[PDB]
Amino acid sequence: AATGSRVTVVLGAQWGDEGKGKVVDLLATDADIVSRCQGGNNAGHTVVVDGKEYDFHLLPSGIINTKAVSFIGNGVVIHLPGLFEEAEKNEKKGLKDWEKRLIISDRAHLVFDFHQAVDGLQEVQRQAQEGKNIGTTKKGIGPTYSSKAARTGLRICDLLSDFDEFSARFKNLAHQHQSMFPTLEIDVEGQLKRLKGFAERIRPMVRDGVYFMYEALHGPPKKVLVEGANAALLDIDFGTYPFVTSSNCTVGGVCTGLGIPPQNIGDVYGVVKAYTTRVGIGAFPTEQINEIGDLLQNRGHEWGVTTGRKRRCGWLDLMILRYAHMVNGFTALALTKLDILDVLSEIKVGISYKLNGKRIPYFPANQEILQKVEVEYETLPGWKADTTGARKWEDLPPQAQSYVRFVENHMGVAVKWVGVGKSRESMIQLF
Amino acid sequence: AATGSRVTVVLGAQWGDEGKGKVVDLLATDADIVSRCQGGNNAGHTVVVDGKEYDFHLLPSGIINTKAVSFIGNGVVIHLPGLFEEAEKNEKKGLKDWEKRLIISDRAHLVFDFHQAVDGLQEVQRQAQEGKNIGTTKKGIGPTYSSKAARTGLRICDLLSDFDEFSARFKNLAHQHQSMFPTLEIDVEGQLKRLKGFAERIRPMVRDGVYFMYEALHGPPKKVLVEGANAALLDIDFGTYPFVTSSNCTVGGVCTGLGIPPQNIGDVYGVVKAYTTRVGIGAFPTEQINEIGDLLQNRGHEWGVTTGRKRRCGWLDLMILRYAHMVNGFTALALTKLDILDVLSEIKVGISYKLNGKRIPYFPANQEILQKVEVEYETLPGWKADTTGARKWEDLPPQAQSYVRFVENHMGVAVKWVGVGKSRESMIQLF
Ligand SMILES: Nc1nc2c(ncn2[C@@H]2O[C@H](COP(=O)(O)OP(=O)(O)O)[C@@H](O)[C@H]2O)c(=O)[nH]1
Ligand SMILES: Nc1nc2c(ncn2[C@@H]2O[C@H](COP(=O)(O)OP(=O)(O)O)[C@@H](O)[C@H]2O)c(=O)[nH]1
Ligand SMILES: Nc1ncnc2c1ncn2[C@@H]1O[C@H](COP(=O)(O)O)[C@@H](O)[C@H]1O
Numbered sequence: 001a002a003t004g005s006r007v008t009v010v011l012g013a014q015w016g017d018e019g020k021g022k023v024v025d026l027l028a029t030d031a032d033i034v035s036r037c038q039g040g041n042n043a044g045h046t047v048v049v050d051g052k053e054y055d056f057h058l059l060p061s062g063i064i065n066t067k068a069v070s071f072i073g074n075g076v077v078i079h080l081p082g083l084f085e086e087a088e089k090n091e092k093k094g095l096k097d098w099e100k101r102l103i104i105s106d107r108a109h110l111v112f113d114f115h116q117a118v119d120g121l122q123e124v125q126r127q128a129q130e131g132k133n134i135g136t137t138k139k140g141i142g143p144t145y146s147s148k149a150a151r152t153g154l155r156i157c158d159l160l161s162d163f164d165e166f167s168a169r170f171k172n173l174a175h176q177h178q179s180m181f182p183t184l185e186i187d188v189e190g191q192l193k194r195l196k197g198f199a200e201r202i203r204p205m206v207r208d209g210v211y212f213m214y215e216a217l218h219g220p221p222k223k224v225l226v227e228g229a230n231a232a233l234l235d236i237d238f239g240t241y242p243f244v245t246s247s248n249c250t251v252g253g254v255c256t257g258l259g260i261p262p263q264n265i266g267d268v269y270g271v272v273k274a275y276t277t278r279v280g281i282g283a284f285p286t287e288q289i290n291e292i293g294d295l296l297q298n299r300g301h302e303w304g305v306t307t308g309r310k311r312r313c314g315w316l317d318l319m320i321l322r323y324a325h326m327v328n329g330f331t332a333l334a335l336t337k338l339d340i341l342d343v344l345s346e347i348k349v350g351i352s353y354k355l356n357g358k359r360i361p362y363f364p365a366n367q368e369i370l371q372k373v374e375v376e377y378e379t380l381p382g383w384k385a386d387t388t389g390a391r392k393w394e395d396l397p398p399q400a401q402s403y404v405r406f407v408e409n410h411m412g413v414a415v416k417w418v419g420v421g422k423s424r425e426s427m428i429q430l431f
Numbered sequence: 432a433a434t435g436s437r438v439t440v441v442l443g444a445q446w447g448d449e450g451k452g453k454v455v456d457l458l459a460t461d462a463d464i465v466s467r468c469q470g471g472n473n474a475g476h477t478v479v480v481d482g483k484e485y486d487f488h489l490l491p492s493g494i495i496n497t498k499a500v501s502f503i504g505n506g507v508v509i510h511l512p513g514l515f516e517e518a519e520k521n522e523k524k525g526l527k528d529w530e531k532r533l534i535i536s537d538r539a540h541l542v543f544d545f546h547q548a549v550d551g552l553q554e555v556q557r558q559a560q561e562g563k564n565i566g567t568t569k570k571g572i573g574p575t576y577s578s579k580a581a582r583t584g585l586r587i588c589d590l591l592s593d594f595d596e597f598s599a600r601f602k603n604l605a606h607q608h609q610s611m612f613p614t615l616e617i618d619v620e621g622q623l624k625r626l627k628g629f630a631e632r633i634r635p636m637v638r639d640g641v642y643f644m645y646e647a648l649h650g651p652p653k654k655v656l657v658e659g660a661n662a663a664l665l666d667i668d669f670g671t672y673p674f675v676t677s678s679n680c681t682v683g684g685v686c687t688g689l690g691i692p693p694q695n696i697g698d699v700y701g702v703v704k705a706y707t708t709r710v711g712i713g714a715f716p717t718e719q720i721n722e723i724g725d726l727l728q729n730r731g732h733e734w735g736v737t738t739g740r741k742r743r744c745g746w747l748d749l750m751i752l753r754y755a756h757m758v759n760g761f762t763a764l765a766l767t768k769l770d771i772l773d774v775l776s777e778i779k780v781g782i783s784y785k786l787n788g789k790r791i792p793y794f795p796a797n798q799e800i801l802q803k804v805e806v807e808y809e810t811l812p813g814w815k816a817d818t819t820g821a822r823k824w825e826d827l828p829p830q831a832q833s834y835v836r837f838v839e840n841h842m843g844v845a846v847k848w849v850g851v852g853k854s855r856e857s858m859i860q861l862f
């Protein structure tokens with residue numbers, strides 16, 4: 001009561017695209033507030049309800065709920081054009097009056113056109129040299145966060161304030177990036193002029209995030225939902241550095257991105273796919289480059305929800321799962337895409353790693369090591385049956401139930417939900 | 432029990448140098464583990480016990496305790512030379528076998544010599560232009576964090592691994608900074624060669640931070656202490672941006688810098704000076720540029736614990752205090768330097784801000800606004816008496832007790848400790 005109302009969190013336990021948009025949407029139906037705390041439009045959250053399919057990137061997935069306000073915390077990095085582009089895309093799909101239910105924290109940073117530009121420049125520059133890069137989405141997320149750290153970036157509040165002072169700051173930040181990539185050209189006045197538009201357009205939805213969020217957690221009880229982006233192993237600190245994103249997708253990112261204390265955090269749900277996927281470059285212990293990987297890739301439709309780039313696929317990997325829990329402290333799990341395994345006669349799942357006939361004690365801080373480990377697999381009987389229609393724990397068949405426990409057990413975290421489809425109803429609740 | 436043992440946190444509520452080193456030391460006597468989660472040697476924590484005076488920067492203030500292990504989490508940025516320089520400085524002061532009780536998280540980033548260099552370059556470059564800069568400590572903290580965000584920086588684990596691959600990465604990171612400051616010269620082989628030394632020297636204290644910290648919080652009960660650096664209004668997200676430091680000094684930084692979940696966080700203590708001080712550039716609502724400021728400056732010895740640069744001083748400011756609590760969620764307060772006010776006949780303390788005869792509703796996201804506010808002051812009777820010897824709540828005189836309540840009340844947070852001196856015993860405990 002004195003502490004306040006506690007926040008419910010939905011986070012990624014692997015390398016993103018675990019189905020956070022799906023889980024968030026299910027819990028949002030109730031929610032008074034749904035918000036984002038980290039990342040930018042590099043994120044890609046797909047929601048499927050009553051026949052329509054959405055794909056949000058900056059917009060909180062609860063935006064769909066008219067009876068709820070959607071929030072974008074200070075931790076997030078926003079690319080104005082990209083924001084509106086996304087809104088338009090969804091408006092022409094049924095989304096209406098979203099503006100009246102969207103709130104932008106005035107402390108969040110801005111992804112400027114050139115940030116996205118140098119991001120690409122940075123990638124090709126890495127390829128043309130090492131012949132190996134990160135595999136960024138080229139949305140400037142990296143550069144924006146690096147600008148933020150340097151305290152050179154610009155924030156929503158700076159945009160609404162005196163444009164003259166803004167334009168000066170803008171001028172210098174642009175000239176600075178050009179110093180890194182003297183090839184990078186920037187049409188200052190163009191962007192600047194378009195920015196003034198965006199400013200006056202974004203202005204009504206902007207507010208003090210700290211105050212806003214504080215008022216909501218200490219006033220009359222409210223159901224607040226925090227939608228995480230990316231995932232645990234993509235976390236700037238704990239992920240497979242440097243093959244990660246530039247924000248803390250782990251639980252700390254919630255306090256960082258919204259400005260709320262730990263006691264105001266309640267249930268922390270770890271969304272975990274029934275198998276593993278990674279879109280960018282970097283170590284992937286269980287990766288299956290064969291007919292299996294192809295099957296998962298195809299039955300799971302694991303491809304660029306925009307670019308069409310198929311994602312790397314592999315078996316379930318408990319090492320990353322447990323390491324993710326050590327950092328996040330999940331209160332319960334969301335096990336998604338079980339239906340994808342309905343076909344397999346037997347399912348393997350990585351339980352531990354060993355370097356030289358030697359089982360390593362914990363997840364490697366050095367990603368380069370992770371790339372040289374031999375994983376020990378456990379082979380589990382498949383249930384070989386269609387579960388897309390299961391809606392209760394008893395609908396699921398033997399091996400299927402055992403597969404849930406298996407995950408539930410080796411992670412020492414109970415599974416609260418089981419996903420068997422993309423839509424809101426294609427979900428089973430264990431308790 | 433299932434959750435684990437909870438961590439005690441000590442954080443800054445103003446603009447740093449509130450006396451965290453003092454509070455941490457008092458609580459460390461007990462502690463099994465004392466650790467740092469953010470910042471670098473830019474920090475400056477002074478401890479005074481049994482006649483000796485210390486000033487740590489990277490070394491956790493509990494280092495003094497032989498019966499305890501000192502930890503440096505992944506969130507921190509380490510400058511090897513600076514680390515050892517500090518250790519030596521303290522060894523020649525009584526510190527012995529610290530190496531046997533210090534542990535470095537293998538995921539923390541490295542502040543390279545050039546980082547400190549470009550930091551200075553960046554400052555002068557800001558002065559020679561705008562005639563206004565940040566007032567950094569010139570320790571590369573900023574550049575290191577910007578490298579980290581870009582995923583270009585290097586970590587402890589990268590240092591211990593194949594030096595050949597390290598040296599290559601190093602080579603490129605250095606050439607990159609030179610592209611920003613083509614004036615900046617870097618003796619690659621020199622630093623590189625010295626780094627190999629540091630590597631083999633730091634090697635024995637390095638360990639997997641996530642695992643280490645996890646084992647300690649879920650195994651047999653332990654008393655773990657987290658020593659925060661800098662302070663709330665210096666927080667990269669919530670402080671007076673851009674006039675802040677490049678890390679999250681707020682509570683989220685604990686989960687970010689150590690990799691521990693929110694439920695593993697317990698008491699969060701806000702250290703608050705009985706008056707306000709800021710060392711660098713930026714808005715300072717209550718700043719007193721006169722005989723008062725001089726008095727506080729002199730009775731409080733508020734000067735560079737190294738450079739000798741006197742710090743800006745001003746009355747207590749409740750606006751920043753409450754805003755700090757909104758973000759940190761202090762479980763109790765540590766009110767330091769009460770003795771400094773023993774002389775004043777009457778003490779003023781800022782209670783709210785008003786822009787144009789209009790009282791602003793909350794702390795300004797835009798620092799430039801904060802610079803144009805007129806604060807409303809409350810004048811409180813001084814106790815005019817020496818409290819340096821007070822050790823119990825009843826030792827303190829009337830107006831003194833009322834001053835504590837005043838803070839305790841307007842912040843809606845109980846004051847757990849009252850500081851009346853620099854030493855460990857110069858402290859009163861209210862409960
Ligand atoms: N068949 C099936 N697809 C699912 C399930 N859960 C989620 N999906 C789909 O898997 C994809 C995951 O991609 P994505 O939306 O990026 O997840 P996010 O990034 O974590 O929000 C989406 O297209 C979802 O519709 C499930 O239980 N079954
Ligand atoms: N007189 C007096 N000095 C104090 C008290 N508490 C702390 N100090 C001193 O105030 C200074 C604060 O600077 P600093 O060590 O940077 O604090 P930190 O950066 O928060 O650890 C130190 O020199 C302390 O010894 C107190 O109650 N009374
Ligand atoms: N929406 C996303 N889904 C999955 N992985 C992502 C997503 N956005 C970024 N990543 C990963 O994050 C890493 C860094 O890319 P970026 O986030 O663009 O800086 C890469 O390995 C990407 O594959």
Ligand SMILES: Nc1ncnc2c1ncn2[C@@H]1O[C@H](COP(=O)(O)O)[C@@H](O)[C@H]1O
Nearest residue numbers: 447473474475567568572675676710711
């Ligand atoms: N040890 C410290 N004590 C107080 N303020 C600090 C300290 N270190 C950095 N700051 C402040 O942090 C801001 C950014 O400097 P830096 O932390 O060096 O990037 C400046 O306004 C400094 O005054």
Ligand SMILES: [Mg+2]
Nearest residue numbers: 017043044045
């Ligand atoms: Mg996605």
Ligand SMILES: [Mg+2]
Nearest residue numbers: 448474475476
């Ligand atoms: Mg200090």
